[PDB]
Design an enzyme around this catalytic site. Structure first.
Site, short mmCIF file in Angstrom:
data_model
loop_
_atom_site.label_atom_id
_atom_site.label_comp_id
_atom_site.label_asym_id
_atom_site.label_seq_id
_atom_site.Cartn_x
_atom_site.Cartn_y
_atom_site.Cartn_z
N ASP A 8 0.81 -1.22 -0.03
CA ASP A 8 0.17 0.04 0.04
C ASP A 8 1.07 1.40 0.12
O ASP A 8 2.10 1.15 0.38
CB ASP A 8 -0.78 -0.08 1.05
CG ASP A 8 -1.65 0.95 1.28
OD1 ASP A 8 -2.44 1.20 0.38
OD2 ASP A 8 -1.90 1.83 2.26
N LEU A 9 0.44 2.14 -0.72
CA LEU A 9 1.18 3.51 -0.26
C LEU A 9 0.78 4.49 0.75
O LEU A 9 1.47 4.59 1.56
CB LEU A 9 1.18 4.41 -1.81
CG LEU A 9 2.24 5.49 -1.89
CD1 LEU A 9 2.10 5.64 -3.58
CD2 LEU A 9 1.88 6.64 -1.10
N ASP A 10 -0.43 4.94 0.64
CA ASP A 10 -0.87 6.15 1.59
C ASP A 10 -0.71 5.63 3.00
O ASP A 10 -1.54 4.66 3.34
CB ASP A 10 -2.05 6.85 1.19
CG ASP A 10 -2.32 6.98 -0.35
OD1 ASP A 10 -1.34 7.72 -0.93
OD2 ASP A 10 -3.18 6.82 -0.78
N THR A 16 0.75 10.36 3.31
CA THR A 16 -0.58 10.79 2.46
C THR A 16 -1.89 10.33 2.76
O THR A 16 -2.78 11.17 2.47
CB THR A 16 -0.21 10.65 1.03
OG1 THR A 16 0.33 9.28 0.97
CG2 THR A 16 0.80 11.48 0.47
N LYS A 45 -10.12 4.95 5.14
CA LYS A 45 -8.50 4.46 4.55
C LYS A 45 -8.79 3.26 3.63
O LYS A 45 -9.11 2.32 4.20
CB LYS A 45 -7.51 4.30 5.95
CG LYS A 45 -7.16 5.57 6.68
CD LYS A 45 -6.42 5.15 7.94
CE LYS A 45 -5.82 6.58 8.47
NZ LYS A 45 -5.09 6.05 9.87
N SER A 114 -1.75 -0.09 -4.23
CA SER A 114 -2.40 1.22 -3.87
C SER A 114 -3.80 1.54 -4.61
O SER A 114 -3.76 1.03 -5.86
CB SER A 114 -1.54 2.30 -4.08
OG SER A 114 -2.08 3.57 -3.90
N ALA A 115 -4.96 1.82 -3.87
CA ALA A 115 -5.97 2.27 -4.56
C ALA A 115 -5.88 3.49 -5.16
O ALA A 115 -6.67 4.07 -5.72
CB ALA A 115 -7.22 2.00 -3.51
N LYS A 145 -10.83 -2.27 -2.55
CA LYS A 145 -10.43 -2.56 -1.37
C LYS A 145 -11.92 -2.50 -0.47
O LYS A 145 -12.31 -1.30 -0.90
CB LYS A 145 -9.30 -1.69 -0.50
CG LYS A 145 -8.05 -2.14 -1.32
CD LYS A 145 -6.67 -1.38 -0.65
CE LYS A 145 -5.78 -1.45 -1.38
NZ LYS A 145 -4.56 -0.65 -0.72
N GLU A 169 0.10 -2.72 4.99
CA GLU A 169 -1.12 -1.72 5.01
C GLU A 169 -1.56 -1.27 6.37
O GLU A 169 -1.29 -1.99 7.57
CB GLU A 169 -2.31 -2.87 4.67
CG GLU A 169 -2.90 -2.49 3.37
CD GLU A 169 -3.68 -1.27 2.91
OE1 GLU A 169 -3.79 -0.91 3.92
OE2 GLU A 169 -4.01 -1.06 1.87
N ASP A 170 -1.88 0.16 6.07
CA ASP A 170 -2.40 0.90 7.34
C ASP A 170 -3.77 0.95 7.63
O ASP A 170 -4.09 1.53 8.52
CB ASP A 170 -1.88 2.23 7.08
CG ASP A 170 -2.45 3.02 6.07
OD1 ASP A 170 -2.77 2.57 4.91
OD2 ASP A 170 -2.85 4.30 6.32
O1 LIG Z 1 -8.42 9.66 -5.03
P1 LIG Z 1 -7.23 8.66 -5.25
O2 LIG Z 1 -5.77 9.32 -5.19
O3 LIG Z 1 -7.44 7.68 -6.56
O4 LIG Z 1 -7.02 7.80 -3.87
C1 LIG Z 1 -8.12 6.75 -3.46
C2 LIG Z 1 -7.67 6.00 -2.37
O5 LIG Z 1 -6.32 5.74 -2.33
C3 LIG Z 1 -5.92 4.97 -1.09
O6 LIG Z 1 -4.65 4.73 -1.22
C4 LIG Z 1 -5.95 5.66 0.08
O7 LIG Z 1 -6.13 5.06 1.57
C5 LIG Z 1 -7.70 6.34 0.11
O8 LIG Z 1 -7.69 7.40 1.23
C6 LIG Z 1 -7.98 6.83 -0.88
O9 LIG Z 1 -9.29 7.46 -1.15
MG LIG Z 2 -3.20 3.16 3.05
#
Ligand SMILES: O=P(O)(O)OC[C@H]1O[C@@H](O)[C@H](O)[C@@H](O)[C@@H]1O
Ligand SMILES: [Mg+2]
Ligand SMILES: [Mg+2]
Length: 218
Positions: A8-10, A16, A45, A114-115, A145, A169-170
């Site tokens: 996962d990234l954020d 982020t 999240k 990452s989503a 997710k 993952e967080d």
């Molecule tokens: O709006 P983006 O950048 O496509 O991100 C979608 C999701 O990305 C995930 O990595 C985050 O945990 C979520 O908070 C976020 O909504």
């Molecule tokens: Mg995350």
């Protein structure tokens, strides 16, 4: 031994998740919804942009037009994209850069799960793109997710079975996605938020190859 790590990234690679929270909160308050606090945000999240907006609306039992829904998601993303322009390599979370170097050393595949559509931009801001063997495009999976699809796709992209992969993952949604993929989750955050049933570390300095080591062996 495990053969891949699915990141996962954020909130895992960098801070982020805080930015997504501040942006979603600002958006919610603009439409009169005041319930996006840190506790509620644990539900957001690891959730997709549209899903996140829908959760916020549902929290309020609020209905908006399809045109408005689309504008709101765009509004939040435009704000979030501005917020992340100055992210740099100095913002990489402690342990992460070394972990990526150590994994590549040891021939362990590295994939992004990452989503976030903004993930490739962020990896470029942090000078991390070259560590990754693959990035699973979240637009390409049929389910987000907490569905496991992104993790399955990430493992696939690097030629490794999910059962032979560790997922970092967080988030609650993301931990569920890792469990359902067959990969071994190691969360970062508070047990209060993420559960007492998997391995959870308090911060990313704990994400060493030695520890992933340690956890895998049991
Ligand atoms: O709006 P983006 O950048 O496509 O991100 C979608 C999701 O990305 C995930 O990595 C985050 O945990 C979520 O908070 C976020 O909504
Ligand atoms: Mg995350
Ligand atoms: Mg490359």
């Amino acid at each position: 031994m495990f053969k891949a790590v699915l990141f996962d990234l954020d909130g895992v690679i960098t801070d982020t998740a805080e930015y997504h929270f501040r942006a979603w909160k600002a958006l919610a308050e603009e439409i009169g919804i005041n319930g996006v606090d840190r506790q509620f945000n644990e539900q957001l999240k690891g959730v997709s942009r549209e899903d996140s907006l829908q959760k916020i609306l549902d929290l309020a039992d609020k209905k908006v037009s399809a045109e408005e829904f689309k504008e709101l998601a765009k509004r939040k993303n435009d704000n979030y994209v501005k917020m992340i322009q100055d992210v740099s390599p100095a913002d990489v979370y402690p342990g992460i850069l070394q972990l990526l170097k150590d994994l590549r050393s040891n021939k362990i595949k590295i994939a992004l799960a990452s989503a976030s559509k903004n993930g490739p931009f962020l990896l470029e801001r942090m000078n991390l793109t070259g560590y990754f063997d693959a990035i699973a495009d979240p637009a390409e999976v049929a389910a987000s997710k907490p569905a496991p699809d992104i993790f399955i796709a990430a493992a696939h992209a690097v030629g490794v079975a999910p059962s032979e992969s560790i997922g970092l993952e967080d988030s609650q949604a993301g931990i569920q996605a890792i469990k359902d993929s067959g990969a071994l989750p190691i969360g970062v955050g508070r047990p209060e938020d993420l559960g007492d049933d998997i391995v959870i570390v308090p911060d990313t300095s704990h994400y060493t190859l030695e520890f992933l080591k340690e956890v895998w062996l049991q």
